[PDB]
């Protein structure tokens, strides 16, 4: 059982509960005043994980109930954080975030991530952060942090890590992404080169590896998204960073009489019930879901010639149409 | 067979198995050569190798007998190497005058037995074993004297007889010596007269690079012995081998009782030890010399008809364009980067004046931009072509590391000067990763190099200003609008100093990314690698002999023609700093160095400016 235990870890430790007297002293107590200790017997730690499993024996069966119905993508999509109403697109993408892949190795070699980086903008409501508690609950090796919050020394590793190092190979989640000040933003600005942090300070020359994914919930410049201001004005963030984000979901709220009825019906229905979907959808349990995603990450697909060319042409059209729009 | 206790490594068996181990290369997959070196010096301490016995047969098992039972095996090994010295001498008859040289003490110093994982991983089940360890040394303790042969006395008569310690205990006879006399009275132990042997103590952190993070590393005190004592100082991160030991400690206080939890330390029997064609002007003497005593090879030689091909290709008008596509075949578009670097290969013209002068040909290039832009790939390629260049990462660097190490040689146990990384890089091209990220003390080296073109070392042993003349190609990763001059970070004075500073930016190409994707998304297919940029006309080995030829046989001068346009460019920029001018006149002369022109045209200074303006068309945003 030795070395099984590691610092900072909640664990149910079972064992015979015993004294080991007294070594003396022996004058002071008097007596005998045992003071005891716990002999370890068994060890069960809370919170033990894909991508590592061999089989894929009869567990595929547990995947198939999910597959056979077909339209897995929309099904799972909806099945992420059903607790909130709307934003099927946002969730639609978050499924991808959880899945990730495929990166690449150029054989020389250097790497290209490798993963997805999501932002969620808009304010004050729309419940953006609940999606992040959601994800960091579903994904293993997920970690939820906030700016003031998680200190700069929170993400970097001291010599005696946290956040980014603590959660890597899996999704990291950030709230209040504006208030994080400066030194933090440099870390995160760099981590989109993936595979890196570099700590040159004092007793540390190391460069540790963070394979982290990042999801960042942020609020537009005060108060909320002033439409008389251009984008990038009401987003306080520099363009050096946003180029890194592949998908920025800006969630803006304009009151709509029809829809908000539906919403209110939802948030009244639950509370009133615990289980949200009825007539009809089947919410996919996070456990089996994690299994499916686990079986997903194993594939490493490759592009055909036709989709490539298509991507290119559509990219020229997207560039040209974006710039013809004007500054 | 003479079984020995529980170690069960038999005497008069393994001795012979080791005795016929002699004279082997063999194998491998030295040995007697190094021993024959050993016999003269009288240094003793045979360092061995390990691994030798593995996979070699016989003594495949001896490796396991030593690894599992090093205690006896080292003693037997020493006896056997001693008697193999004795058998070495009789072969040459009378040696060294005569038998006294054999009497001198010898020992084996085994090392590198398997690769052990840390101190931390270690089981309590292996307490007699050879164990690698690594970590810095926090302190070297003062020398404690260790009993070897004990001395004794009595009130009667007094008599001088004494007994050796052997095992880690001391038992003196109650009564008595010589004779007799007797009486029962307690023995008088002289403290100072008896013999002693050096035992240091060395604290070692467990591999601070390998840690639970954040828990502070665990101490390992390795006690050494003999010659090894006082052979080290502190902070040495390298490695150490030796036998693990658990010995009881006396606790509270007094009482003569054992704490029953044995402390653990390492015997550490061994310790082991530390941590395109060249230009003419640079060669100089080795041309002016090496002719007299003669020699062969050196400067690359060219046939006639291929020369006749170069002087033909020079005629081709698109040449300046052509070579630019030929440099990086894998790398797509971004032609002006390829191009500026193309001139980095031809850079400048060297000038000695009467004396001094020496502006060389050096031209220096930083380039920054969005990640995954191939900015590192170029570094690799230039590194591959340039004959003498050296490739350094950020933070893997220090001002001591870039010149003048003054290390101990460890072969001769002497102090020898080593060339730093910039001194090596003298001539050709130093390549730098992540330049933005260098520590603040570093970059203070570069203000010396970039200007002076030499480095001045007054430190430590030898005080001199030594020459490093080298190009620099630096990569940078920045932290629309914003001040750009702000957004490269850097102190702006250093930043203005770089000859040509590239900023990667969208060229509005559409119309590019498709082409580039055609390039990279290949391989891909075909799986086999054929061509690459095809169909594109490309030189391959021709461009290197071309570049070389250009460099040695051409020495361009601006003449009356550059200066007008040359200046008006600088003013046009001023309407920055004077370095930008220096830049232009050097960079341009590279262009003119190409095309085989001894004199610059008034033309060709146009693009020579435009390259500096190229980044400006990229500074618009």
Taking an 8 Å cut-off on Cβ atoms, the answer to whether B437 and A198 are in contact is: yes
Contact between residue B500 and residue B365 where contact means Cβ atoms under 8 Å apart: yes
| Residue to substitute from A240, A241, A322, A327, interface B, most B β-carbons within 10 A | A240
Superfamily name with CATH number, domain A56-327: P-loop containing nucleotide triphosphate hydrolases (3.40.50.300)
CA gyration radius for chain B?
35
- Report the residue from B214, B478, B517 with minimal CB separation from A157: B214
Q: Residue B202 forms beta bridges with which residues? A: B140, B222
CA distance B557 to B560: 9
CA distance B304 to B502: 39
CA distance A114 to A213: 9
Please give the DSSP secondary-structure letter assigned to residue B595. G
- Report the residue from B120, B208, B477 with minimal CB separation from A193: B477
On chain A, the residues whose CB falls within 8 A of the CB of B395 are 198, 200, 205, 207
Closest CA of chain B from A280, distance in Å: 44
Picking from B583, B616, B608, B581, the residue whose alpha carbon sits closest to that of residue B503 is B616
Picking from B497, B469, B430, the residue whose alpha carbon sits closest to that of residue B351 is B469
CA distance B534 to A57: 48
On chain A, the residues whose CB falls within 8 A of the CB of B214 are 157-161
| Residue to substitute from A109, A192, A319, interface B, most B β-carbons within 10 A | A319
Distant-in-sequence, close-in-space partners of B96: CB < 8 Å, separation ≥ 6: B39, B89
| A238 in B contact zone (CB under 8 Å) | yes
Same domain, residue pair B185 and B221 = yes
Tokens of B508: 């509005």
Taking an 8 Å cut-off on Cβ atoms, the answer to whether B478 and A319 are in contact is: no
Q: Reduced to 3 DSSP states, what percent helix, strand and coil does chain B have, rounded to the nearest 5? A: 30, 10, 55
Same domain, residue pair B92 and B170 = no
CA distance B90 to B39: 13
Contact between residue B346 and residue B593 where contact means Cβ atoms under 8 Å apart: yes
Picking from B598, B212, B7, the residue whose alpha carbon sits closest to that of residue A5 is B212
CA distance A265 to B240: 72
Whether residue A244 is annotated as binding a ligand: the answer is: yes
Taking an 8 Å cut-off on Cβ atoms, the answer to whether B510 and A320 are in contact is: yes
Strand B137-140, strand B202-205: pairing: antiparallel
Same domain, residue pair B198 and B49 = no
Chain B from 522 to 561: CB within 8 A of any A CB: none
Picking from B415, B424, B429, B409, the residue whose alpha carbon sits closest to that of residue B455 is B424
Taking an 8 Å cut-off on Cβ atoms, the answer to whether B480 and A239 are in contact is: yes
Which class for B584: exposed (0-12), middle (13-18), buried (19 or more C-beta within 10 A)?
buried
User: Which chain A residue's Cα is nearest to B477?
Assistant: A190
Quick one: CA dihedral B400, B401, B402, B403, positive or negative?
positive
Same domain, residue pair B263 and B151 = yes
Q: What is the DSSP string of A187-251?
A: HHHHGGG-S-----STT---------EEEEE-PPSSSS--TTS-TTTSS-S-HHHHTT-SEEEE-
| A4 in B contact zone (CB under 8 Å) | no
Q: What is the DSSP string of B69-87?
A: -HHHHHHHHHHHHHHHHHH
Whether the link from the prior residue into B98 is cis, omega within 30° of 0, is yes
SS3 at position A268: helix
Please give the DSSP secondary-structure letter assigned to residue B252. S
In the sheet where A143-146 sits, what is the strand order?
A143-146, A171-175, A213-217, A117-121, A247-250
| A13 in B contact zone (CB under 8 Å) | no
- Report the residue from B209, B370, B482 with minimal CB separation from A206: B209
CA distance A266 to A260: 9
Place of tokens 């001395």: B151
Closest CA of chain B from A72, distance in Å: 29
On chain A, the residues whose CB falls within 8 A of the CB of B436 are none
CA distance A139 to A20: 44
Please give the DSSP secondary-structure letter assigned to residue B471. E
Which class for A258: exposed (0-12), middle (13-18), buried (19 or more C-beta within 10 A)?
exposed
| Residue to substitute from B252, B331, B401, B479, interface A, most A β-carbons within 10 A | B479
Distant-in-sequence, close-in-space partners of B549: CB < 8 Å, separation ≥ 6: B302, B307, B310
Quick one: CA dihedral B130, B134, B139, B140, positive or negative?
positive
Place of tokens 């997920």: A142
Q: How many other CB atoms sit within 10 Å of the CB of residue A237?
A: 19
Q: Residue B502 forms beta bridges with which residues? A: B367
Contact between residue A142 and residue A286 where contact means Cβ atoms under 8 Å apart: no
Q: How many other CB atoms sit within 10 Å of the CB of residue B324?
A: 19
Helices A88-99 and A130-138 cross at an angle (nearest 10°) of 30
Same domain, residue pair B69 and B82 = yes
| Residue to substitute from B237, B395, B509, interface A, most A β-carbons within 10 A | B395
Backbone angles phi, psi at B21, to 5 degrees: -70, -20
Element (H, E) at B304: helix B304-313
Picking from B318, B210, B386, B221, the residue whose alpha carbon sits closest to that of residue B537 is B318
Contact between residue B146 and residue B197 where contact means Cβ atoms under 8 Å apart: yes
- Report the residue from B395, B439, B513 with minimal CB separation from A207: B395
Taking an 8 Å cut-off on Cβ atoms, the answer to whether A240 and B211 are in contact is: no
SS3 at position B204: strand
Contact between residue B501 and residue B367 where contact means Cβ atoms under 8 Å apart: yes
Count Cβ neighbours within 10 Å for each residue of B110-142 and write b for 16 or more, e otherwise. Answer: bbbbeebebbeebeeeeeebbbbbbbbbeebee
Same domain, residue pair B10 and B145 = no
CA atoms within 13 A on the CB side of B604: 25
| B394 in A contact zone (CB under 8 Å) | yes
For chain B, report the end-to-end CA distance as a whole number of angstroms.
Answer: 88
Which class for B551: exposed (0-12), middle (13-18), buried (19 or more C-beta within 10 A)?
buried
Strand A117-121, strand A213-217: pairing: parallel
| A36 in B contact zone (CB under 8 Å) | no
Contact between residue B336 and residue B611 where contact means Cβ atoms under 8 Å apart: yes
CA distance B76 to B425: 51
Same domain, residue pair B126 and B233 = yes
Contact between residue B234 and residue B141 where contact means Cβ atoms under 8 Å apart: no
Strand B500-503, strand B365-368: pairing: parallel
Tokens of A199: 């700590």
CA distance B619 to B621: 6
| B275 in A contact zone (CB under 8 Å) | no
- Cα B29 to chain centroid, rounded: 25
CA distance B531 to A276: 60
Deposited experimental method? cryo-EM
CA atoms within 13 A on the CB side of B11: 9
Chain A from 108 to 127: CB within 8 A of any B CB: 108, 110, 112
Expressed in Å, this structure's resolution amounts to 4.8
Q: How many other CB atoms sit within 10 Å of the CB of residue B492?
A: 12
CA distance A158 to A327: 45
Contact between residue A259 and residue A274 where contact means Cβ atoms under 8 Å apart: no
Domain ranges of chain A: 56-327
CA distance B21 to B52: 9
CA distance B208 to B180: 63
Dihedral in degrees, nearest 10, Cα atoms A212, A215, A221, A227: 140
The CA distances from residue A227 to A123, A222, A230, A231, A325, in Å, are 13, 12, 7, 8, 17
Query: Over B274-308, what HEC string results?
Result: CCCCCCHHHHCHHHHCCCCCCCCCCCCCCCHHHHH
**Which range of residues forms the domain containing residue B17?**
1-115
CA distance B171 to B44: 33
Taking an 8 Å cut-off on Cβ atoms, the answer to whether A7 and B215 are in contact is: yes
CA distance B570 to B587: 13
SS3 at position B433: coil
Whether residue B371 is annotated as binding a ligand: the answer is: yes
Q: Residue A120 forms beta bridges with which residues? A: A217, A249
User: Which chain A residue's Cα is nearest to B434?
Assistant: A198
Please give the DSSP secondary-structure letter assigned to residue B153. B
Same domain, residue pair B264 and B212 = yes
| B114 in A contact zone (CB under 8 Å) | no
User: Which chain A residue's Cα is nearest to B478?
Assistant: A240
Beta strands in B104-205 (DSSP E): 137-140, 144-147, 149-150, 163-164, 196-199, 202-205
User: Which chain A residue's Cα is nearest to B259?
Assistant: A23
- Cα B322 to chain centroid, rounded: 39
Same domain, residue pair B78 and B136 = no
Count Cβ neighbours within 10 Å for each residue of B405-416 and write b for 16 or more, e otherwise. Answer: beeeeeeeeeee
Taking an 8 Å cut-off on Cβ atoms, the answer to whether B482 and A238 are in contact is: yes
CA distance B515 to A14: 65
| A189 in B contact zone (CB under 8 Å) | yes
**What region does B221 belong to: left with phi over 0, alpha with psi -120 to 50, or beta?**
beta
- Cα A171 to chain centroid, rounded: 3
Please give the DSSP secondary-structure letter assigned to residue B557. B
Picking from B368, B374, B363, the residue whose alpha carbon sits closest to that of residue B327 is B374
Quick one: CA dihedral A70, A71, A73, A76, positive or negative?
negative
The CA distances from residue A39 to A7, A36, A55, A141, B120, in Å, are 18, 10, 37, 31, 22
Same domain, residue pair B204 and B244 = yes
Same domain, residue pair B102 and B13 = yes
Count Cβ neighbours within 10 Å for each residue of A112-137 and write b for 16 or more, e otherwise. Answer: ebebbbbbbbbbeebbbbebbbbbbe
| B508 in A contact zone (CB under 8 Å) | yes
On chain B, the residues whose CB falls within 8 A of the CB of A189 are 479
Q: What is the DSSP string of B473-504?
A: EEEE-----S-HHHHT-S-HHHHHHSSEEEE-
Place of tokens 């260790």: B146
Closest CA of chain A from B105, distance in Å: 44
């Amino acid at each position: 059982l030795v070395r099984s235990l590691s610092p900072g870890d909640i664990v149910d430790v079972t064992g015979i509960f015993l004294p080991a007297p007294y070594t003396g002293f022996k004058a002071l107590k008097a007596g005998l005043l045992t003071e005891t200790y716990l002999e370890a017997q068994f060890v069960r730690q809370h919170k033990k994980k894909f991508a590592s499993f061999s089989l894929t024996s009869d567990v595929e069966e547990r995947v198939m109930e999910l597959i056979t119905s077909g339209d897995v993508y929309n099904r799972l999509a909806k099945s992420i954080a059903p607790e909130i109403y709307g934003n099927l697109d946002v969730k639609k993408a978050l499924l991808l975030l959880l899945v990730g892949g495929v990166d690449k190795r150029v054989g020389d070699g250097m790497k290209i991530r490798g993963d997805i980086n999501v932002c969620l903008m808009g304010d004050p409501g729309v419940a953006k952060s609940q999606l992040l508690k959601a994800i960091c609950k579903i994904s293993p090796r997920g970690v939820y942090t906030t700016g003031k919050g998680s200190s700069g020394v929170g993400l970097t590793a001291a010599v005696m890590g946290g956040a980014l190092v603590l959660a890597d190979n899996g999704i990291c989640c950030i709230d209040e992404f504006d208030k994080m000040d400066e030194s933090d933003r440099t870390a995160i600005h760099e981590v989109m080169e993936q595979q890196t942090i570099s700590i040159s300070k004092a007793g540390i020359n190391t460069t540790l590896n963070a394979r982290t994914s990042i999801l960042a919930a942020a609020n537009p410049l005060y108060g909320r998204y002033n439409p008389r201001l251009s984008p990038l004005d009401n987003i306080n963030l520099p363009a050096a960073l946003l180029s890194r984000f592949d998908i920025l979901f800006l969630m803006l709220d304009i009151p709509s009489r029809d829809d908000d009825e539906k919403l209110a019906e939802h948030v009244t229905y639950v509370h009133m019930h615990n289980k949200q979907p009825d007539l009809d959808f089947t919410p996919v349990e996070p456990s089996k879901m994690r299994e499916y995603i686990a079986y997903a990450k194993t594939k490493r697909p490759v592009m055909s010639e036709a989709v490539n060319d298509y991507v290119v042409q559509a990219y020229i059209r997207l560039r040209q149409d974006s710039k013809r729009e004007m500054d | 067979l003479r079984i020995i206790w529980g170690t069960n490594v038999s005497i008069q068996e393994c001795t012979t198995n080791f005795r016929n181990f002699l004279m082997s290369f063999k194998y491998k997959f030295y040995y007697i050569k190094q021993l024959n070196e050993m016999r003269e010096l009288g240094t003793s301490n045979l360092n061995l190798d390990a691994r030798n016995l593995l996979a070699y047969k016989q003594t495949e098992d001896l490796y396991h007998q030593l690894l599992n039972y090093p205690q006896e095996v080292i003693s037997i090994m020493d006896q056997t190497i001693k008697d193999c010295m004795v058998s070495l001498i009789v072969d040459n008859n009378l040696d060294y005058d005569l038998d006294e040289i054999e009497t001198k003490f010898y020992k084996v110093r085994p090392y590198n037995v398997g690769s052990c994982k840390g101190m931390r991983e270690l089981n309590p089940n292996d307490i007699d074993k050879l164990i690698n360890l690594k970590g810095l040394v926090l302190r070297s303790t003062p020398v404690i004297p260790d009993m070897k042969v004990a001395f004794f006395k009595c009130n009667v008569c007094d008599h001088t007889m004494a007994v050796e310690i052997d095992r880690g205990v001391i038992q003196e006879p109650a009564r008595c010596e010589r004779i007799d006399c007797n009486e029962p009275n307690s023995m008088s132990l002289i403290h100072n007269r008896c013999s002693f042997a050096d035992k240091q103590v060395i604290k070692l952190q467990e591999t601070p690079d390998f840690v639970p993070d954040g828990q502070t590393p665990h101490s390992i005190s390795l006690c050494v012995y003999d010659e090894l004592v006082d052979s080290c100082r502190a902070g040495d991160r390298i490695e150490v081998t030796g036998t693990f030991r658990s010995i009881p400690i006396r606790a509270n206080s007094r009482q003569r009782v054992l704490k029953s939890l044995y402390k653990t330390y390492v015997d550490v029997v061994h310790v082991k030890k530390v941590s395109d064609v060249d230009t003419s002007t640079i060669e100089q003497e080795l041309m002016q010399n090496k002719v007299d005593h003669n020699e062969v090879e050196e400067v690359r030689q060219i046939t006639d008809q291929d020369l006749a091909k170069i002087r033909e290709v020079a005629a081709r008008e698109d040449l300046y364009s052509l070579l630019a596509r030929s440099i990086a075949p894998s790398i797509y578009e971004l032609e002006d980067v390829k191009k500026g670097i193309l001139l980095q290969l031809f850079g400048g013209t060297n000038k000695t004046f009467t004396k001094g002068g020496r502006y060389r040909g050096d031209i220096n290039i930083l380039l920054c931009g969005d990640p995954s832009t191939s900015k590192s790939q170029i570094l690799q390629y230039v590194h591959k072509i340039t004959p003498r260049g050296v490739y350094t990462s950020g933070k893997g660097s220090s001002a001591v590391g870039l010149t003048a190490y003054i290390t101990r040689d460890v072969d001769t146990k002497q102090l020898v000067l080593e060339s730093g990384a910039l001194v090596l890089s003298d001539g050709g091209v130093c390549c730098i990763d992540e330049f933005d990220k260098m520590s603040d003390s570093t970059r203070s080296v570069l203000h010396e190099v970039m200007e002076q073109q030499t480095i001045s070392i007054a430190k430590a042993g030898i005080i001199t200003t030594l020459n490093a003349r080298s190009s620099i190609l630096a990569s940078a990763n920045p932290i629309p609008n914003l001040p750009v001059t702000e957004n490269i970070d850097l102190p702006p004075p250093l930043l203005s100093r770089f000859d040509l500073v590239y900023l990667v930016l969208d060229k509005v190409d559409e119309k590019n990314d498709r082409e580039l994707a055609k390039h990279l998304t290949n391989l891909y297919l075909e799986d086999k690698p054929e061509h690459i940029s095809q169909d594109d006309v490309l030189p391959v080995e021709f461009l290197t002999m071309y570049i070389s030829y250009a460099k040695e046989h051409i020495h361009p001068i601006i003449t009356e023609a550059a200066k007008t346009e040359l200046v008006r460019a600088y003013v046009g920029m001023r309407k920055a700093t004077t370095r930008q001018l220096e830049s232009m006149i050097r960079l341009a002369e590279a262009h003119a160095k190409m095309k085989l022109k001894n004199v610059v045209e008034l033309e060709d200074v146009q693009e020579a400016v435009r390259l500096i303006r190229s980044a400006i068309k990229d500074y618009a945003t």
